[PDB]
Amino acid sequence: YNKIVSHLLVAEPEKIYAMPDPTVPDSDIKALTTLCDLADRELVVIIGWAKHIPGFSTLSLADQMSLLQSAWMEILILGVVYRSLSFEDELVYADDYIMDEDQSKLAGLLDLNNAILQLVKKYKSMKLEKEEFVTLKAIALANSDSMHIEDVEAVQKLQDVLHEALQDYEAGQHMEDPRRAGKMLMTLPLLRQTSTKAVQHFYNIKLEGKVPMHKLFLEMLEAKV
Amino acid sequence: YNKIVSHLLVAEPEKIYAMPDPTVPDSDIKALTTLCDLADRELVVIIGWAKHIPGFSTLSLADQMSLLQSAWMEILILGVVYRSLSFEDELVYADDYIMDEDQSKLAGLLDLNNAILQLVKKYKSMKLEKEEFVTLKAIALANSDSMHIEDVEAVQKLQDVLHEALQDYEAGQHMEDPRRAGKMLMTLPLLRQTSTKAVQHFYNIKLEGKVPMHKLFLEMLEAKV
Ligand SMILES: CC(C)(c1ccc(O)cc1)c1ccc(O)cc1
Ligand SMILES: CC(C)(c1ccc(O)cc1)c1ccc(O)cc1
């Protein structure tokens, strides 16, 4: 099929581990510390991954940073959604960190994790493919609506190149549904909504000061609130 | 062109007036009272308008209510965006109520109104047509991601019928841009984001108790928070 899609597939990063501390008693603080720690390390991987998107590394460093600062939370959440597709009512943050309803309750994440499960259920019913996943991830990056973009034309071109890839892929692989590309795009508002709420939630947790957070995650949280 | 589009055009409601109280001194409280009062009356008009969308009135009353309860804020904001297209840095809430930067500052709405202006600027550059406007409004209603839907198949069919109309319209009227429909759909995440933030803001203002709010607006605010 489409070359941008196959390129995005080979650029897809390796899974990383949560490694929750086995000497520490389970609590809300432990789960949150674990999750924030995992996200901090994934952000490093996401920065590396973005460099493989055609056109991205030719934007100015400022525009690259602006896109990443706007989109990072949506990209993280899309990841856990995709990892969770073949599970039921469980969220696979990592192979060694799967949250069910009870742990979500414990961590104070029930409402947020329930919103993420709503995303999972929608992609389950549409039978989201890996090809579609990696392309939406790139589109979420490019369509992240940063207020601080310099070369808007270049960013729009980036959006168009990725949108075309999605369109091309869907035309060749899903002839039975000529509106599948548009259906995929219409899942983006729920991703943006959930991401907006997630940024607010973890910012409150930053302010409360009981959960340790690393520099990158904090920096990224700061730029979005 | 497409019949659903022409039908949505004739179903488009009359503009209503803000009628700010001319005996009351300008303040944050006056602006907010005016805006909330305007929204309350527009919600009545939006309920009436929805009945004209093909398929909508055949959903159960519960599913109709669920869609409206999820989508109402996006529909209000899309309205002010459309009214503001031919203005510069001004938001036309009504013909007798146009907010500039200073009044937004006064009302404590600078950040929220700046997000709405970001929407305006994006549709200006794409040259949003009235045909496209009324169709996106209907799509925002149908794609509102309520958690409490009963007949999901019927709602998805509603989404598909409206998405097809957009697709049909764009194919016939904008042959020069075969991705225009998808570009329109990719504006929806910014609308959802702004609407999510707006619901949080006015809910805080509800809690503070200094701004009088009518029953419908309060009821709708309650169902979304
Ligand atoms: C940002 C967050 C810590 C996270 C961590 C890791 C991850 O892969 C995806 C998301 C997160 C967000 C929302 C949420 O409900 C749980 C965890
Ligand atoms: C909901 C609100 C009072 C409104 C009132 C009327 C309207 O047409 C659109 C929006 C509103 C939301 C966000 C905002 O920044 C100003 C006013």
PDB file of all heavy atoms in Angstrom, chain B residues 7 47-64 67 141 158, unseen atoms left out:
ATOM      1  N   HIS B   7     -31.640  21.384   3.055  1.00  0.00           N
ATOM      2  CA  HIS B   7     -32.597  21.268   4.135  1.00  0.00           C
ATOM      3  C   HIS B   7     -32.061  21.913   5.417  1.00  0.00           C
ATOM      4  O   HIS B   7     -32.806  22.571   6.136  1.00  0.00           O
ATOM      5  CB  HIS B   7     -32.936  19.807   4.380  1.00  0.00           C
ATOM      6  CG  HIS B   7     -33.911  19.588   5.492  1.00  0.00           C
ATOM      7  ND1 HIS B   7     -35.267  19.782   5.343  1.00  0.00           N
ATOM      8  CD2 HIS B   7     -33.729  19.181   6.771  1.00  0.00           C
ATOM      9  CE1 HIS B   7     -35.877  19.503   6.481  1.00  0.00           C
ATOM     10  NE2 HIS B   7     -34.964  19.137   7.365  1.00  0.00           N
ATOM     11  N   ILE B  47     -32.797  23.234  20.647  1.00  0.00           N
ATOM     12  CA  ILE B  47     -33.660  22.083  20.822  1.00  0.00           C
ATOM     13  C   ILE B  47     -34.678  21.987  19.684  1.00  0.00           C
ATOM     14  O   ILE B  47     -34.922  20.907  19.140  1.00  0.00           O
ATOM     15  CB  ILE B  47     -34.373  22.144  22.170  1.00  0.00           C
ATOM     16  CG1 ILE B  47     -33.367  21.907  23.292  1.00  0.00           C
ATOM     17  CG2 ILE B  47     -35.463  21.098  22.243  1.00  0.00           C
ATOM     18  CD1 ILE B  47     -33.947  22.112  24.661  1.00  0.00           C
ATOM     19  N   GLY B  48     -35.248  23.125  19.306  1.00  0.00           N
ATOM     20  CA  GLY B  48     -36.176  23.168  18.196  1.00  0.00           C
ATOM     21  C   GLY B  48     -35.513  22.856  16.871  1.00  0.00           C
ATOM     22  O   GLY B  48     -36.100  22.201  15.992  1.00  0.00           O
ATOM     23  N   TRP B  49     -34.282  23.328  16.714  1.00  0.00           N
ATOM     24  CA  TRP B  49     -33.578  23.149  15.452  1.00  0.00           C
ATOM     25  C   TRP B  49     -33.235  21.666  15.215  1.00  0.00           C
ATOM     26  O   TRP B  49     -33.355  21.165  14.096  1.00  0.00           O
ATOM     27  CB  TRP B  49     -32.330  24.035  15.429  1.00  0.00           C
ATOM     28  CG  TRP B  49     -31.238  23.594  14.491  1.00  0.00           C
ATOM     29  CD1 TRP B  49     -31.119  23.895  13.171  1.00  0.00           C
ATOM     30  CD2 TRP B  49     -30.100  22.794  14.830  1.00  0.00           C
ATOM     31  NE1 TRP B  49     -29.977  23.320  12.654  1.00  0.00           N
ATOM     32  CE2 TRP B  49     -29.332  22.643  13.656  1.00  0.00           C
ATOM     33  CE3 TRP B  49     -29.654  22.188  16.016  1.00  0.00           C
ATOM     34  CZ2 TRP B  49     -28.142  21.911  13.629  1.00  0.00           C
ATOM     35  CZ3 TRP B  49     -28.469  21.455  15.986  1.00  0.00           C
ATOM     36  CH2 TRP B  49     -27.730  21.322  14.803  1.00  0.00           C
ATOM     37  N   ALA B  50     -32.846  20.967  16.275  1.00  0.00           N
ATOM     38  CA  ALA B  50     -32.407  19.582  16.166  1.00  0.00           C
ATOM     39  C   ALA B  50     -33.482  18.679  15.556  1.00  0.00           C
ATOM     40  O   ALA B  50     -33.161  17.719  14.850  1.00  0.00           O
ATOM     41  CB  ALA B  50     -31.991  19.050  17.531  1.00  0.00           C
ATOM     42  N   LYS B  51     -34.746  18.998  15.823  1.00  0.00           N
ATOM     43  CA  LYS B  51     -35.872  18.213  15.316  1.00  0.00           C
ATOM     44  C   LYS B  51     -35.921  18.166  13.805  1.00  0.00           C
ATOM     45  O   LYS B  51     -36.561  17.290  13.248  1.00  0.00           O
ATOM     46  CB  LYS B  51     -37.197  18.760  15.845  1.00  0.00           C
ATOM     47  CG  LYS B  51     -37.663  18.081  17.144  1.00  0.00           C
ATOM     48  CD  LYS B  51     -37.066  18.712  18.402  1.00  0.00           C
ATOM     49  N   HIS B  52     -35.225  19.084  13.138  1.00  0.00           N
ATOM     50  CA  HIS B  52     -35.201  19.118  11.672  1.00  0.00           C
ATOM     51  C   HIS B  52     -34.102  18.290  11.029  1.00  0.00           C
ATOM     52  O   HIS B  52     -34.069  18.143   9.807  1.00  0.00           O
ATOM     53  CB  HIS B  52     -35.070  20.554  11.183  1.00  0.00           C
ATOM     54  CG  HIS B  52     -36.295  21.366  11.421  1.00  0.00           C
ATOM     55  ND1 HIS B  52     -36.371  22.328  12.405  1.00  0.00           N
ATOM     56  CD2 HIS B  52     -37.512  21.325  10.835  1.00  0.00           C
ATOM     57  CE1 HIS B  52     -37.578  22.863  12.399  1.00  0.00           C
ATOM     58  NE2 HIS B  52     -38.288  22.276  11.451  1.00  0.00           N
ATOM     59  N   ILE B  53     -33.190  17.771  11.839  1.00  0.00           N
ATOM     60  CA  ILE B  53     -32.121  16.938  11.309  1.00  0.00           C
ATOM     61  C   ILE B  53     -32.689  15.558  11.009  1.00  0.00           C
ATOM     62  O   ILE B  53     -33.248  14.920  11.899  1.00  0.00           O
ATOM     63  CB  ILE B  53     -30.945  16.837  12.292  1.00  0.00           C
ATOM     64  CG1 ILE B  53     -30.450  18.244  12.659  1.00  0.00           C
ATOM     65  CG2 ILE B  53     -29.823  16.008  11.695  1.00  0.00           C
ATOM     66  CD1 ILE B  53     -29.415  18.250  13.742  1.00  0.00           C
ATOM     67  N   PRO B  54     -32.574  15.108   9.748  1.00  0.00           N
ATOM     68  CA  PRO B  54     -33.098  13.806   9.299  1.00  0.00           C
ATOM     69  C   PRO B  54     -32.668  12.675  10.209  1.00  0.00           C
ATOM     70  O   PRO B  54     -31.476  12.473  10.416  1.00  0.00           O
ATOM     71  CB  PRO B  54     -32.486  13.640   7.907  1.00  0.00           C
ATOM     72  CG  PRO B  54     -32.288  15.051   7.431  1.00  0.00           C
ATOM     73  CD  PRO B  54     -31.902  15.840   8.659  1.00  0.00           C
ATOM     74  N   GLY B  55     -33.634  11.966  10.773  1.00  0.00           N
ATOM     75  CA  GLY B  55     -33.345  10.864  11.669  1.00  0.00           C
ATOM     76  C   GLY B  55     -33.368  11.215  13.145  1.00  0.00           C
ATOM     77  O   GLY B  55     -33.590  10.348  13.986  1.00  0.00           O
ATOM     78  N   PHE B  56     -33.136  12.480  13.475  1.00  0.00           N
ATOM     79  CA  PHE B  56     -32.977  12.846  14.873  1.00  0.00           C
ATOM     80  C   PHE B  56     -34.239  12.580  15.697  1.00  0.00           C
ATOM     81  O   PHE B  56     -34.162  12.057  16.816  1.00  0.00           O
ATOM     82  CB  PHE B  56     -32.578  14.327  15.018  1.00  0.00           C
ATOM     83  CG  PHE B  56     -32.303  14.732  16.446  1.00  0.00           C
ATOM     84  CD1 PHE B  56     -31.054  14.511  17.017  1.00  0.00           C
ATOM     85  CD2 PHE B  56     -33.304  15.286  17.228  1.00  0.00           C
ATOM     86  CE1 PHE B  56     -30.801  14.862  18.333  1.00  0.00           C
ATOM     87  CE2 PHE B  56     -33.063  15.639  18.541  1.00  0.00           C
ATOM     88  CZ  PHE B  56     -31.805  15.426  19.096  1.00  0.00           C
ATOM     89  N   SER B  57     -35.399  12.951  15.156  1.00  0.00           N
ATOM     90  CA  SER B  57     -36.640  12.889  15.932  1.00  0.00           C
ATOM     91  C   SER B  57     -37.183  11.456  16.053  1.00  0.00           C
ATOM     92  O   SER B  57     -38.157  11.209  16.772  1.00  0.00           O
ATOM     93  CB  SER B  57     -37.693  13.825  15.323  1.00  0.00           C
ATOM     94  OG  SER B  57     -37.937  13.512  13.961  1.00  0.00           O
ATOM     95  N   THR B  58     -36.528  10.518  15.369  1.00  0.00           N
ATOM     96  CA  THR B  58     -36.900   9.113  15.434  1.00  0.00           C
ATOM     97  C   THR B  58     -36.071   8.358  16.487  1.00  0.00           C
ATOM     98  O   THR B  58     -36.371   7.214  16.818  1.00  0.00           O
ATOM     99  CB  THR B  58     -36.752   8.431  14.046  1.00  0.00           C
ATOM    100  OG1 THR B  58     -35.398   8.001  13.849  1.00  0.00           O
ATOM    101  CG2 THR B  58     -37.142   9.395  12.938  1.00  0.00           C
ATOM    102  N   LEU B  59     -35.027   8.998  17.011  1.00  0.00           N
ATOM    103  CA  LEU B  59     -34.301   8.441  18.145  1.00  0.00           C
ATOM    104  C   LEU B  59     -35.203   8.492  19.358  1.00  0.00           C
ATOM    105  O   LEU B  59     -36.172   9.248  19.374  1.00  0.00           O
ATOM    106  CB  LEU B  59     -33.016   9.220  18.423  1.00  0.00           C
ATOM    107  CG  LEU B  59     -32.029   9.430  17.274  1.00  0.00           C
ATOM    108  CD1 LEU B  59     -30.942  10.397  17.711  1.00  0.00           C
ATOM    109  CD2 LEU B  59     -31.426   8.114  16.837  1.00  0.00           C
ATOM    110  N   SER B  60     -34.891   7.709  20.383  1.00  0.00           N
ATOM    111  CA  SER B  60     -35.665   7.791  21.612  1.00  0.00           C
ATOM    112  C   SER B  60     -35.455   9.164  22.248  1.00  0.00           C
ATOM    113  O   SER B  60     -34.443   9.824  21.996  1.00  0.00           O
ATOM    114  CB  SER B  60     -35.273   6.683  22.586  1.00  0.00           C
ATOM    115  OG  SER B  60     -34.002   6.910  23.159  1.00  0.00           O
ATOM    116  N   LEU B  61     -36.415   9.601  23.056  1.00  0.00           N
ATOM    117  CA  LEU B  61     -36.312  10.891  23.728  1.00  0.00           C
ATOM    118  C   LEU B  61     -35.049  10.961  24.577  1.00  0.00           C
ATOM    119  O   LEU B  61     -34.434  12.024  24.703  1.00  0.00           O
ATOM    120  CB  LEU B  61     -37.532  11.160  24.609  1.00  0.00           C
ATOM    121  CG  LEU B  61     -38.837  11.644  23.983  1.00  0.00           C
ATOM    122  CD1 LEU B  61     -39.537  10.549  23.175  1.00  0.00           C
ATOM    123  CD2 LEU B  61     -39.742  12.149  25.092  1.00  0.00           C
ATOM    124  N   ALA B  62     -34.671   9.828  25.162  1.00  0.00           N
ATOM    125  CA  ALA B  62     -33.474   9.767  25.989  1.00  0.00           C
ATOM    126  C   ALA B  62     -32.224   9.998  25.134  1.00  0.00           C
ATOM    127  O   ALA B  62     -31.336  10.767  25.506  1.00  0.00           O
ATOM    128  CB  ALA B  62     -33.387   8.433  26.712  1.00  0.00           C
ATOM    129  N   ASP B  63     -32.158   9.339  23.982  1.00  0.00           N
ATOM    130  CA  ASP B  63     -30.997   9.485  23.117  1.00  0.00           C
ATOM    131  C   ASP B  63     -30.936  10.901  22.524  1.00  0.00           C
ATOM    132  O   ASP B  63     -29.847  11.477  22.406  1.00  0.00           O
ATOM    133  CB  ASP B  63     -31.003   8.425  22.014  1.00  0.00           C
ATOM    134  CG  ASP B  63     -30.456   7.080  22.490  1.00  0.00           C
ATOM    135  OD1 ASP B  63     -29.951   6.997  23.633  1.00  0.00           O
ATOM    136  OD2 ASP B  63     -30.524   6.108  21.708  1.00  0.00           O
ATOM    137  N   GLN B  64     -32.093  11.470  22.177  1.00  0.00           N
ATOM    138  CA  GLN B  64     -32.137  12.866  21.730  1.00  0.00           C
ATOM    139  C   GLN B  64     -31.588  13.792  22.813  1.00  0.00           C
ATOM    140  O   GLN B  64     -30.782  14.667  22.529  1.00  0.00           O
ATOM    141  CB  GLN B  64     -33.548  13.298  21.380  1.00  0.00           C
ATOM    142  CG  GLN B  64     -34.184  12.586  20.215  1.00  0.00           C
ATOM    143  CD  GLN B  64     -35.617  13.029  20.051  1.00  0.00           C
ATOM    144  OE1 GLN B  64     -35.984  14.114  20.497  1.00  0.00           O
ATOM    145  NE2 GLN B  64     -36.437  12.193  19.435  1.00  0.00           N
ATOM    146  N   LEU B  67     -27.644  13.385  23.263  1.00  0.00           N
ATOM    147  CA  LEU B  67     -26.904  14.099  22.230  1.00  0.00           C
ATOM    148  C   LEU B  67     -26.882  15.603  22.529  1.00  0.00           C
ATOM    149  O   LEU B  67     -25.820  16.225  22.504  1.00  0.00           O
ATOM    150  CB  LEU B  67     -27.497  13.846  20.832  1.00  0.00           C
ATOM    151  CG  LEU B  67     -27.423  12.417  20.277  1.00  0.00           C
ATOM    152  CD1 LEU B  67     -27.873  12.368  18.817  1.00  0.00           C
ATOM    153  CD2 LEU B  67     -26.040  11.869  20.426  1.00  0.00           C
ATOM    154  N   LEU B 141     -23.343  17.720  16.635  1.00  0.00           N
ATOM    155  CA  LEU B 141     -24.419  17.143  17.434  1.00  0.00           C
ATOM    156  C   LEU B 141     -24.343  15.599  17.456  1.00  0.00           C
ATOM    157  O   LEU B 141     -24.395  14.974  18.514  1.00  0.00           O
ATOM    158  CB  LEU B 141     -25.789  17.593  16.917  1.00  0.00           C
ATOM    159  CG  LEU B 141     -27.022  17.011  17.657  1.00  0.00           C
ATOM    160  CD1 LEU B 141     -27.025  17.375  19.141  1.00  0.00           C
ATOM    161  CD2 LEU B 141     -28.327  17.448  17.015  1.00  0.00           C
ATOM    162  N   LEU B 158     -26.941   8.048  11.968  1.00  0.00           N
ATOM    163  CA  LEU B 158     -27.098   9.493  11.924  1.00  0.00           C
ATOM    164  C   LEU B 158     -25.769  10.164  11.537  1.00  0.00           C
ATOM    165  O   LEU B 158     -25.740  11.002  10.634  1.00  0.00           O
ATOM    166  CB  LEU B 158     -27.605  10.007  13.272  1.00  0.00           C
ATOM    167  CG  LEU B 158     -27.880  11.505  13.342  1.00  0.00           C
ATOM    168  CD1 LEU B 158     -28.861  11.912  12.267  1.00  0.00           C
ATOM    169  CD2 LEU B 158     -28.396  11.873  14.722  1.00  0.00           C
TER     170      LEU B 158
END
